[PDB]
Amino acid sequence: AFYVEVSRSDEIQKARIQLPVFGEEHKIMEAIHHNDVVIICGETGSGKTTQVPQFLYEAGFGAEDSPDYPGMVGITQPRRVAAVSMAERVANELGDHGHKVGYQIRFDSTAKEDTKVKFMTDGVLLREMMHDFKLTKYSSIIIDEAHERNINTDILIGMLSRCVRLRAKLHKENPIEHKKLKLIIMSATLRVSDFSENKTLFPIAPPVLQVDARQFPVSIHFNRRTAFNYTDEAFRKTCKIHQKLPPGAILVFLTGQQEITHMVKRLRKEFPFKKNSKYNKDLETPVSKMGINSKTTDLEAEDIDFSVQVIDQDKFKSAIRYEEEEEEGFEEVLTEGQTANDPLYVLPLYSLLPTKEQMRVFQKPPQGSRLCIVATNVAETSLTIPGVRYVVDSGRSKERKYNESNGVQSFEVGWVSKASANQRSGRAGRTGPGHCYRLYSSAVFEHDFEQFKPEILRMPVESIVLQMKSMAIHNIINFPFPTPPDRVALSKAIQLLQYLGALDNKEMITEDGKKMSLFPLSPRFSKMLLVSDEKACLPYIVAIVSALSVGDPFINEFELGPELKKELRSKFYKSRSQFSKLDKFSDVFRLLSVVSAMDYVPKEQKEIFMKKNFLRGKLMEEIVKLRKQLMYIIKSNTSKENIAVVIRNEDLKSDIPSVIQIKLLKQMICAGFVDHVAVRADVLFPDDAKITNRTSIINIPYIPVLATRTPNIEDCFVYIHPTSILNNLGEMPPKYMLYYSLHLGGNNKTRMNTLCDIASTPLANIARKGLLLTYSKPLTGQGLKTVNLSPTERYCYVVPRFGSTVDNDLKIGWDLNPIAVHQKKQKGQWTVIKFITR
Amino acid sequence: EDDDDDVLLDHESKTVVVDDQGKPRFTSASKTKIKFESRKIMVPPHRMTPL
Amino acid sequence: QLLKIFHLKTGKVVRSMKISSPSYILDADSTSTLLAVGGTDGSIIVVDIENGYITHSFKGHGGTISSLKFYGQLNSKIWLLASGDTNGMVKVWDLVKRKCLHTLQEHTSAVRGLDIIEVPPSLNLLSGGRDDIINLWDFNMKKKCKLLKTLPVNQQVESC
Amino acid sequence: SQVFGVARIYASFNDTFVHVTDLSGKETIARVTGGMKVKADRDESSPYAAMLAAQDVAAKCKEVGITAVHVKIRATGGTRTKTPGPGGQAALRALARSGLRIGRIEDVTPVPSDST
Amino acid sequence: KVTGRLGFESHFTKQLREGSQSKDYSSLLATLINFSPAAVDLEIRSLNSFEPFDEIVWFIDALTQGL
């Protein structure tokens, strides 16, 4: 009832006494006994990730004898590597009780039997909570390192607040039919007021506690320059460290799996072993390399490419131009017994490691060999390496970056914040007085490193609410987030998902919606790459979405546009009318064909095409870098073999589409941007349009869907951008056009980002999946009759209405051409199954 | 008022990527005819001209 | 007509393939997710069982195909196949490069019962038969050799 | 590379036999009749009975390993019908359909030179 | 085959929506009495009967204000 007797080993016992998380254990357990939602504001290097669930098993969480808390214990590491490492850690810690510890890192893994204090992953228990909205099983829930402000942590505590509210409400009247629910949140920083003292997240104010530790002096060293190749900078620095500096292990904060494996094999090459055992151990570490776990697991920040970034040396120096021999950290003496060419026990640590390389960090090196870790953010707050003294930091971590309405959308490696950078630097003075080497200047560290942002701010809210719908929570408009986003924007996100087909009219996610939610990309592009696996158009569509995600390739008006300027503009227009232009005059076939032209060129003939046909070098190289990776991503998710697909060369390169494939890709990009459609104003207001041929082509007015039509003239009247093939030829613009986005010019004319042209019927066929269009009654005035088969079937002939003109509250919308449908009479209304070809 | 007409309806590799739990996974296989048989039947030479 | 039943509460026919020859030998891996089946002509298809379809063809061989075996340790990069025979031979395939590793024509009847292990890539294998010879080999990854024969007086079927 | 059996399809009266042998003649493989498939005793010379009999022989012979069959049709001979009935063509059509390569169709029915 | 200028809806349901927003149905009933019985059946069999029941309670209130 009160507790069951626990036992641990002697050395781990005294280690728990020596680390300062043993001091506040009674105050924490009494705050847990007196209140459910308890906040802990600890840090890394303390011990709170490990020993607090042991404190909960001491307190009686997991004890069947207590009638208050007879349930499970769930410890929620957001990274599955952290989940398994702390699982084996507390399996060592509880010892004779240590068989009561378990892990569950993916969804296909279910609960193992021998545990009652089990580790898991954030997405794992969110799907668990989704199919168990009640959560009978788990008496307690531990949210550690929630300070990171992940989207998974945000959705996690946003569900868990209402979860613990309803569970406590049902429990406090009757303990028999309803048990307690003890929520224990941890963090690394102390800015936990957005978790505790937010009235939307918690109207009831929960108690806040601390239990931090001690740290030896960290000597931080900023370099006089900042190198371009940070890998070679860190490698040269770390060979000088292991050559000259006193003993103490190394942690190298670098970026990715490829660079980390290259640095690990280079370090093993520089400091090799003669012994076959250690040589084969390093061989096993270099052999076991990759894993993905695409769909049937949770996901992390190792998608490894969705990034349109680009770089150079003048770009880097112009970014850090505020920064205007004897080097810091090169002070102490080499110690005796420590040779300059000592063997190095090298270990990579990225999130895509196997378990039999994730356990090898915590093994002692051979004598005469110094330990070394080359890693990324797993060893920042969750994990810590017992024995490091030198840490060396590149200051760049891979996360999500996206800016709006301009086609920049990259999952790139930016620049880490000041708080997280100092948290990475504080691992130097951790075992003794240590040395951190930050691979830049302190002027750089001052300027471009911000102080304190959430993934819910860095990621689009449409993908955020699609993630919530795949996790099956429906009361999203009033859902308690720490940073609840713009309600206008998330209502536009729900409207956008209804437009794309992810959400029905009763707001439950479809199968196509879940296949959109699997993607680490925008909902529009995810719809594109889900739909275009039809009739061999996938290289064309992946070229188009790669071009829109990388940005504008055409050197058009960042330059000229008297004796050579005329000839250069003439040859520039000739390069436009050349192999850039052969198929139609819509807009975007040039943007397809310039990348299809990258197959018609040998590798040593690289610079002549950009330098002749006015293309940007780094963007034109990163689109043909991005195309392979994006085709890999969508082939991996939609093809019948998930992980094992590879991308050959010519199928990413090219072929040539004639007529059926250009009209098919036209309806594909319509499926991409079905709510960014536009009409020539003759078919809505032919008097105000003044439809004449001598009106300029960037003055024939276009009207978007869903926009308010007040009696002012230029409300919807947005115009064509000058950078299309219209404004360059302009004979007669087709009536229905597409755009990507809108940019207001200086003359108060909202110019466009026009894409293509549809007449009526592929637009209707695309919109049919969406919830844009509302059908009419069957119209058989002068035409041929509706043929039934049954009182629930119909072969009728109906006109569709796009922009919902029923009860027109100024949302402008237009009719289409009549089309023959095949209805099925669902629940009183007549939904449509398909169309009928002529 | 000109409406278009579009349907809009509906090799191998030499490497592995295994799993997070062991469990290897290989790439796709290449694609996969009846017989070449014959039958000789004699004609008696009184049903020859009808044949 | 190959079928697979998921043994769990969904006892439905998950996948169903149309194989070429009527087969009479199957083996799944020591791990899961690999099922090898060879017909009564020379064709040894192997199938990933999760998303069930053909992952390797292995035309390769001759005659109707006797017992065979996998080489599976979880999280490896080797993944061999054993591939016995009726006219006495053992033709070892891998699965990571789709190549015939070593052709071995040495037996006199149906090669039933062969097994693969490593002892410190060493990877010794052992192939019995309806003839009385068990005939273990060293079987290196690049080029292989032979060792002792040690001749049991049986008609060995599945010499584990 | 194929190997050959020999059919020896016996199109008897009130019964039908099919049993493939290796092409010596000694080691017979899978003797079936028309009786051991149907259950009526009236049509143990049925074309359907010979059909599934030849199907089962084809399955067992593909299990053993023979792929082609030199086929030899024998009627009951003697001073009797001297000529195959319907069961011979029925078994012939069945094991010509059932995935088995066929070679050298003949007639080995005995001829009497005027016996009794 | 197709036929242009069949824009959104027929005059019965158009006048029904306008009459329901205008709180009287007199012109709707004046049309409905007037036009042919085959057309009357052809429109009244399809009155869009589903979960908000706007069109069908508008029709019942129209016959209320009629008789």
Ligand SMILES: Nc1ncnc2c1ncn2[C@@H]1O[C@H](COP(=O)(O)OP(=O)(O)O)[C@@H](O)[C@H]1O
């Ligand atoms: N799997 C493991 N095996 C052995 N030691 C570990 C393991 N994980 C963490 N440690 C050690 O335990 C100590 C306590 O850190 P930990 O509890 O993991 O994080 P925090 O300090 O954030 O609570 C650290 O010094 C770390 O080196």
